[PDB]
Amino acid sequence: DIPKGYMDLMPFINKAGCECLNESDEHGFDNCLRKDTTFLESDCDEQLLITVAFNQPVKLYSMKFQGPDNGQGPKYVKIFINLPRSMDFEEAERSEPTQALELTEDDIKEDGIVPLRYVKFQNVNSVTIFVQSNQGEEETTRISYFTFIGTPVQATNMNDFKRVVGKKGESH
Template sequence: MEDSGVPGHIDLLPMVNKAGCECLNESDDHPFTQALNSAGGYLESDTDEQLILYLSFNQAVKLHSMRIKAPADCGPKTIKVFINQPHTIDFDTAESANPIQEITLSPKDLEGELITLKYVKLQNVMNFTIFIKDNQTEAETTQISYLQIIGSPVQTTKMADFKRVAGKKGESH
């Protein structure tokens, strides 16, 4: 697990179900997957500055914060955060729906500063939607070099993992 820089929390990227992720309005040359690793490359919007990022986790998680690295001129400015949507929302829904949190980012935030999320409202998250409404300078497209989601897994108990102590199956004590 990569160190998140936040005590008690980890980088949740290993828990992201990449097959369940989707990005609306991504450029074919610069897809969403390039922003999910720090190896280089970037995500860029296609026809305008708006993007919808849908991340699906392979288990329930608690979200604490995130980091976004992006160019100061065309990085995201206003973002809305939604959780546990049954499917990827469209742009009209993202504009009109009430988010869990709305955040206005400064150019300094886009240098990888910690962006704190409303931890109390993000306790049992299976999927996380980020709607990027606009960018810093009203540039034609929006770019994100790296996106890091920080939090912790929700500890759940799988009943199938329990072993019988005594007696036979179906027998009561």
């Protein structure tokens, strides 16, 4: 599917940065990042907080927060951007989200793509999704597939730098 000129940010997801909260041991975070039946479930409650980190500032167009049709798919999704520190569940509900999204049943299907306000996400470095309920009100929710579609923002990697022209030891 995907829109014209935009690519999935799977290659851009920093495995080091990503961390889920309430993820069950049997079905972990890595499961929901693969295009397989393997999924992620929340152990201690239906609330889940799945954060990701991108290698370089990326832009966001459409995330695909797919979920199982058993009713344990996500229902209400709160997205935050460029969080300086990891989030807390109690403080996550309080804080106002960048885009409060009410997933509809049509979205959870395998082919469903949910559109995000492209204006708000222009320099996202780390996005945290907060699943506040599942469709069936089941004890544990599930994210069948979840990835972000946008474009990469060219970032000036000062780590490389390196002189390209000139001779060393030259002053003003």
